[PDB]
Design a protein around this ligand. Structure first.
Ligand code: ACH
Ligand code: ACH
Lengths: 527, 527
């Protein structure tokens, strides 16, 4: 049967889902690891002991324990990102959408969800891979990984909580995809892993980590790169926060064993409740438990790896949205509110920059302010708001990504860069927030095709183009069958991705990125 | 006789000069100090022992010994600034142009010439005060002062070469004007001292130095302020350069006395020949012998004086030209030539910034470059040239002046600010040089009125407006009888001064000046 599939783990029974006046198969909730519960919490993922009998993959799996957002209870704009299933430590499962008739060998697209590494669900509605599968004839897999303490608590040195385990959960699902995707119609020699934010960052880490490079062919990174400042921590830092979390739970802190054991008796939500109390700064766009540069998953500093070509050479397609920071200002900067134009006074501006660049000394915060301030109109609220928006985004997404793209390209085999700048017509977030972080996702997965969603004709157009660019890149290493230029260090071309006739530009935010990538760090090192 | 005048020093016999189809009196070469020759070299000025008999002031006096510019022999554009009279250590003389009929009590305008303190002549043709005298009915005095080692060599502590003696020569002429200008038709209670560059800097120093404040009423500062980085040196620095000059002349350097004595046997040109060998840096816009912050002429650091209101409160009219730096790049930066468009490569750009900000460490030169570079078009030669032009000017003239104007205004009684941006139609300097340093002078003195000079009708217009603004400011403390706004720290208004209908703007180069006046020094202090 088109829904019964055999895999090296056991048989799996999917279900067929209807899609745009048609249908496809969906094998949802196939497990790829032993449930990381009990004494296995914090431990590296374990392969799923095979099973016998048909595994019933007719419905979405639980979501990993995580911080649920209640900032705007009921507001769809934010709840659309909250776990829509029971959360459980038993969440390591993958979902596959397969065109019907089942292909014999098509390109595979594996989606790694975002969420600052503290959250994420492969079950969100915007991550519904059927329109892409259907529309582009690709096998869409979306995996899940442990987030939060559960996936990133790092007591480097113990094997009980080595850290990066949430990155190994992804590898592991990449492995299950390598080994079994052939029985679903997918070609394991043509899987493109793609992700947004912590997911696009994950993608780039699999591109760097030796033990993952072989499990996929191409990569698409959306609004994130392995080198984003919020993407990783030193082992010492990860240890500090690990201990600190212990303190907030009154754990014996005399040893990693007593520590890990205490943290394992704790119910999930107890860890979640104090999760944010461990950051070392009053900051915006920093999450507590993130990958640690351990010397195992990552051999040395991501930067020396970037510098020495020590990474998987292949083709990559990446980009950023216009207003990446708005979302984080709205949530943790004073002066911003969901319901006002959030015009910002210098007093609140000056506070926003301090939160955005937590590690800067005063001369540093002075350099940022000098660069992002219109001294000829310094008390404009609109300008202070937008200026703060560019600081949060340039510093945390746009510039670290530009650094990666320029370093990778030196050794890669084809880089394609976009700048997404389209505000969905039906966005329920305030206009001041612009083209928000995470809002390209819905175009990439084809929601603009389902009319009951109220997108506009041209937006439908744009979706289809984006799904084609993405699918067509997955299959061939090139987005084009109107050419989206190849990005080269010399010319630096990239393209806009909005409902207008595309246009090519060069040097995405150079002025600013020279500041953040070259000047600032030099400044902060001198002082 | 209209040409015979009595003064407390002796009688003086002028001559009448023809002016625009009319005439006026001119008393040229009246001495105000004992000739600073022989053992008096480097010494403070001595009052002119009175004389008996008519002193014959019918012709211009010698010019002070100084470095003559031979960079472009015969090129008028540069020779127009060279001494046009025999140079001599006997040069302390003043010149007075008086309307005919001799007024009983008109406003007095005393011109202090510029020249980096290393040069200057009160006899240049552009400093010809008859059109202003005639046209505006003001008594125009133009004084002279010792420049170079002769006027600024400072061996602080000896009374034989105290330094600042060239500033005392000016004071002294201000004194002779105070005491005698009444016998020429001038009102000694309404003298406006005005100067350009080292002269506008001098003006502001008389505004600060306690012993000069009383000798004048109002001040006009053109392209210079007391706080310009090239305008003064510490006593230690002045001593260093004093000694160093001695080294270049093989003077016994065992003591100030042996040193001063050696320097006094030296013929004038021997001091001039090695004058430039003493700067402590490879730099552009730095001169060797300049006023020293001695604790006598200047009580404390010009900056604490600026900060504490310790200065003459009155009305001041000041401003800068659009392209102040071009002239110094042309002469000491590689890549610039008088006969080419001087497009500049980054390699030469990067060398120009090093020369422009000699005291900056690397992080400093990195901050300047980041600010003055168009990263989206970094290999443009036009942009690198102009960018270097703005660096030289912003750093050396425009921003220190903006600092003074903002500090003074806090305690002053009326500040008027202009931005001169008109390139004379008949300028013989390359277009790339723009509105050059020193090129407002000719409009201020009314040369555009003499038709045999080929200026355009609208330029004639502009001259007359400028002479009126200047004269009308001198007489009343206000440029207006189309209003030139008063500059306030709050609004910061200023006006353009060109042949188009004037316009008011605010915040002259704020972006940049916050960089130079606030950020840079903070940066260079941290590192
Ligand atoms: C990145 C940092 O993982 O952020 C994702 C943001 N979100 C779409 C609002 C959840
Ligand atoms: C200032 C520094 O005194 O410069 C005057 C420049 N000049 C008009 C070219 C002689």
């Amino acid at each position: 049967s088109e829904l019964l599939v055999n895999t090296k783990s056991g048989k799996v029974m999917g279900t067929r889902v209807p899609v745009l006046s048609s249908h496809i198969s969906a094998f949802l909730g196939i497990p790829f690891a032993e449930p990381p519960v009990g004494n296995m919490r914090f431990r590296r993922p374990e392969p799923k002991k095979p099973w016998s009998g048909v595994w019933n993959a007719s419905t979405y799996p639980n979501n990993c324990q995580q911080y649920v957002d209640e900032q705007f209870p009921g507001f769809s704009g934010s709840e659309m990102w909250n776990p829509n299933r029971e959360m459980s430590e038993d969440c390591l499962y993958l979902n596959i959408w397969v065109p019907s008739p089942r292909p014999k060998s098509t390109t595979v697209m594996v989606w790694i969800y975002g969420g600052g590494f503290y959250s994420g669900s492969s079950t969100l509605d915007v991550y519904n891979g059927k329109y892409l599968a259907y529309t582009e004839e690709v096998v869409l897999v979306s995996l899940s990984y442990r987030v939060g303490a559960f996936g990133f608590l790092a007591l480097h040195g113990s094997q009980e909580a080595p850290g990066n385990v949430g990155l190994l959960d992804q590898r592991m699902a990449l492995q299950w995809v390598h080994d079994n995707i052939q029985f679903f119609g997918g070609d394991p020699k043509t899987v493109t892993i793609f992700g947004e934010s912590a997911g696009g960052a994950s993608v780039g880490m699999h591109i760097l980590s030796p033990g993952s490079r072989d499990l996929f062919r191409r990569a698409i990174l959306q609004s994130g790169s392995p080198n984003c400042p919020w993407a990783s921590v030193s082992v010492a830092e990860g240890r500090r926060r690990a201990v600190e979390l212990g303190r907030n739970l009154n754990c014996n802190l005399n040893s990693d064993e007593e520590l890990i054991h205490c943290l394992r008796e704790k119910k999930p939500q107890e860890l979640i409740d104090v999760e944010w109390n461990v950051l070392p700064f009053d900051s915006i766009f920093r999450f507590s438990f993130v990958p640690v540069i351990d010397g195992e998953f990552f051999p040395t500093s991501l930067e020396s790896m970037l510098n020495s070509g020590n990474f998987k050479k292949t083709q990559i397609l990446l980009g950023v949205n216009k207003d990446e920071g708005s979302f984080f200002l709205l949530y943790g900067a004073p002066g911003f509110s969901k319901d006002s134009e959030s015009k910002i006074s210098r007093e609140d501006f000056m506070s926003g920059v301090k939160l955005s660049v937590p590690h800067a000394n005063d001369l540093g915060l002075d350099a940022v302010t000098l660069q992002y301030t219109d001294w000829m109109d310094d008390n404009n609220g609109i300008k202070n708001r937008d200026g703060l928006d560019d600081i949060v985004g340039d510093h945390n997404v746009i510039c670290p990504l530009m650094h990666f793209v320029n370093k990778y390209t030196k050794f890669g085999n084809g880089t394609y860069l976009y700048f997404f700048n389209h505000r969905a017509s039906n966005l329920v977030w305030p206009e001041w927030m612009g083209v928000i972080h995470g809002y390209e996702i819905e175009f990439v997965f084809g929601l603009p095709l389902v009319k009951e969603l109220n997108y506009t004709a041209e937006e439908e157009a744009l979706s289809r183009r984006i799904m084609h660019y993405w699918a067509t890149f997955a299959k061939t290493g090139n987005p084009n069958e109107s050419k989206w230029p190849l990005f080269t260090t010399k010319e630096q071309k990239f393209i806009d991705l909005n409902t207008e006739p595309m246009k090519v530009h060069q040097r995405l935010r150079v002025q600013m990125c020279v500041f953040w990538n070259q000047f600032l760090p030099k400044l902060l090192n001198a002082t």
